Amino acid sequence: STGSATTTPIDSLDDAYITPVQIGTPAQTLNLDFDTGSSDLWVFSSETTASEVDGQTIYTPSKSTTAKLLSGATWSISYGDGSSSSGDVYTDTVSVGGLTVTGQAVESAKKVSSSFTEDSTIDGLLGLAFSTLNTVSPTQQKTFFDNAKASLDSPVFTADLGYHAPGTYNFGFIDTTAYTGSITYTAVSTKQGFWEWTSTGYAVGSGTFKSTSIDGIADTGTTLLYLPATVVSAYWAQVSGAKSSSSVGGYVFPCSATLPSFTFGVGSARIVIPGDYIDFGPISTGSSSCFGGIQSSAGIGINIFGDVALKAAFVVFNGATTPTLGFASK
């Protein structure tokens, strides 16, 4: 089998992407944030504290003839941005772009943090990291990809995120029309439960490539590109007036600037992030100070190849017995 679904930016800055997901019988369609940096499929629901729901579409398990309470199971997750959610668990039928899994754990939120409530466009998350990170207790549950894998034509999914435009998540096949040149594959460590890999270096604008190992995660659920302070300083030094602002919480730059590109290495191959991808607009409405899309990972504890990086590539998440990651230009 295969599946193919369009993923759509939630706003004009590409802060996140939503993908429609069918849950239950008859189908209830929710718009979920596909997140390769976590491993829980959780949704706003009829069980979510009413004051914490503000415009989201909810899953109502009592209206699904295929929903079953997973007795005694609870979940609770905290994300890198400080947000969180928790609740209980149903199994139900879940379909993405024509690909159907029966008996998928659907984690129903009883509580969500303010960031989730305040974002009316995201109805929940669909985790695509390794199932070892799944938070369901006392019996850990599998991700949608893990459940689908054996049925897929090939045990892969691909992320093709757009810049200020829709893109695509495919399951079970590689669309050879969706990228240019060749796909370069690179080793993955699953030791921390992430799609963790080592970039071979970077360049800023038309500058020379610096060969240096940068370990980090391919994370579709993180907006920005988080890299070591040395690398980030080298980037922003090429932008007149850019500075790190403790009050704002990162590097800012004059909105009048033209940003240089940023290149990262994948083996001997190179992925170029155009300068415009690195502009996250005014820090507050009407400001001429703009927020940068490349930020320091110092104090996160891990480097993160988030959407800013991933959207410059066609990315293969290869879930073979020994997983790997592939990157192509597009």
Active-site annotation holder among 38, 108, 199, 261: 199
Residues 52 and 65 in one domain: yes
Residues 89 and 160 in one domain: yes
Residues 223 and 119 in one domain: no
Q: Token pair 């100070």 is at which residue?
A: 289
What is the full DSSP assignment across 255-320? TTPPPPPEEEEETTEEEEE-GGGGEEEESSTT-SEEEESEEE-TTTSSEEE-HHHHTTSEEEEE-S
Task: Give the range of the structural domain holding residue 153, as residue numbers without chain letter.
Answer: 5-174
* CATH number of the domain bearing residue 201: 2.40.70.10
Residues 49 and 169 in one domain: yes
Residues 191 and 117 in one domain: no
Return the structure tokens found at 19. Answer: 């993908």
Overall domain count for the chain: 2
9's CB contacts (< 8 A; 6+ apart) are: 15, 16, 17, 162, 164, 165, 166
Residues 324 and 283 in one domain: yes
| Cβ neighbours, 10 Å, residue 69 | 12
Residues 148 and 220 in one domain: no
C-alpha–C-alpha distance, residues 122 and 35, integer Å? 12
Return the structure tokens found at 30. Answer: 């929710």
Amino acid at 89: V
Q: Pick from 121, 143, 174: which residue ends a domain?
A: 174
**β partners of residue 272:** 263
Query: What one-character DSSP code corresponds to residue 177?
Result: T
Neighbour-count burial for 248-284, b at 16+ CB within 10 Å, e otherwise = eebbbbeeeeebbbbbbbbeebbbebebebbbbeebe
C-alpha–C-alpha distance, residues 282 and 294, integer Å? 15
Burial class (CB in 10 A: 0-12, 13-18, 19+), 29: middle
N- to C-terminal Cα separation, the chain? 25
Q: Pick from 142, 174, 206: which residue ends a domain?
A: 174
Upstream peptide bond of 26 is cis (omega within 30 degrees of 0): yes
Q: How was this structure determined?
A: X-ray
Residues 158 and 271 in one domain: no
Annotated active-site residue 146? The verdict is: no
Residues 259 and 158 in one domain: no
Residues 284 and 166 in one domain: no
Annotated active-site residue 113? The verdict is: no
Longest CA–CA span in the chain (Å) reads 60
Tell me if residue 229 falls in helix, strand or coil: helix
Residues 147 and 187 in one domain: no
Residues 83 and 221 in one domain: no
Q: Pick from 144, 174, 204: which residue ends a domain?
A: 174
Active-site annotation holder among 14, 33, 35, 219: 35
318's CB contacts (< 8 A; 6+ apart) are: 155, 156, 185, 324, 325, 326
What is the experimental resolution, given in Å to one decimal place? 1.3
